[PDB]
Write a protein that holds these residues in place. Structure first.
Motif, mmCIF file in Angstrom:
data_model
loop_
_atom_site.group_PDB
_atom_site.id
_atom_site.type_symbol
_atom_site.label_atom_id
_atom_site.label_comp_id
_atom_site.label_asym_id
_atom_site.label_seq_id
_atom_site.Cartn_x
_atom_site.Cartn_y
_atom_site.Cartn_z
ATOM 1 N N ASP A 199 -0.497 4.455 -0.986
ATOM 2 C CA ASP A 199 -1.318 5.599 -0.447
ATOM 3 C C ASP A 199 -1.420 5.439 1.255
ATOM 4 O OD1 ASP A 199 -2.199 6.875 -3.010
ATOM 5 O OD2 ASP A 199 -2.521 4.733 -3.398
ATOM 6 N N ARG A 212 -5.932 -0.533 1.629
ATOM 7 C CA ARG A 212 -6.463 -1.359 0.499
ATOM 8 C C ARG A 212 -5.481 -1.660 -0.605
ATOM 9 N NH1 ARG A 212 -11.260 -2.975 1.749
ATOM 10 N NH2 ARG A 212 -12.556 -2.107 3.021
ATOM 11 N N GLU A 224 -1.620 -1.768 -7.739
ATOM 12 C CA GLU A 224 -0.355 -1.809 -6.528
ATOM 13 C C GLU A 224 0.114 -3.004 -6.483
ATOM 14 O OE1 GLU A 224 -1.953 0.317 -2.834
ATOM 15 O OE2 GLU A 224 -3.562 0.389 -4.319
ATOM 16 N N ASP A 283 -4.066 3.476 2.637
ATOM 17 C CA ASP A 283 -5.239 3.491 3.098
ATOM 18 C C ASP A 283 -5.992 2.464 3.469
ATOM 19 O OD1 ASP A 283 -7.417 2.481 0.374
ATOM 20 O OD2 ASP A 283 -5.473 1.978 0.671
ATOM 21 N N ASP A 324 0.718 -1.243 -0.047
ATOM 22 C CA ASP A 324 0.058 -0.035 -0.097
ATOM 23 C C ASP A 324 0.783 1.278 -0.009
ATOM 24 O OD1 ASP A 324 -2.183 1.654 0.336
ATOM 25 O OD2 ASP A 324 -3.275 0.486 1.479
HETATM 26 CA CA LIG Z 1 -4.172 2.578 -2.109
#
Ligand SMILES: [Ca+2]
Ligand SMILES: [Ca+2]
Length: 97
Positions: free
Chosen positions: A64, A68, A73, A66, A62
């Motif tokens: 970012d 998820r 990714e 977040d 991950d």
């Molecule tokens: Ca993400």
């Protein structure tokens, strides 16, 4: 060579890999899916082991941050990081081993 491209075989494998755990079909993979996945594999391993591969995979999966992981990714980490433990375990586990 290739920056982050994906071959036909590799791509397909990843696609199904994500669509596998994707029960709702959202294209995202949280920590619950990774843990439940590796844990559902039912293998001769301790708790910290599975929790480690899932925790590390998520942390290194991950960008970012977040909670998820998206198709790009995961696929990216596979085409990026060399032969890792979480990677092989994922492709395998997700493939019912
Ligand atoms: Ca993400
Ligand atoms: Ca999902």
């Amino acid at each position: 060579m290739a920056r982050g491209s994906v071959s036909d075989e590799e791509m397909m494998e990843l696609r199904e890999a994500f669509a596998k755990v994707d029960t709702d079909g959202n294209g995202y993979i949280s920590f619950n899916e990774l843990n439940d996945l590796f844990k559902a594999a039912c293998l001769p391993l301790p708790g910290y082991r599975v929790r480690e591969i899932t925790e590390n995979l998520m942390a290194t999966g991950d960008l970012d941050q977040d909670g998820r992981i998206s198709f790009d990714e995961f696929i990216k980490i596979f085409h990026g990081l060399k032969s890792t433990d979480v990677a092989k375990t994922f492709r395998k586990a997700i493939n019912k081993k």
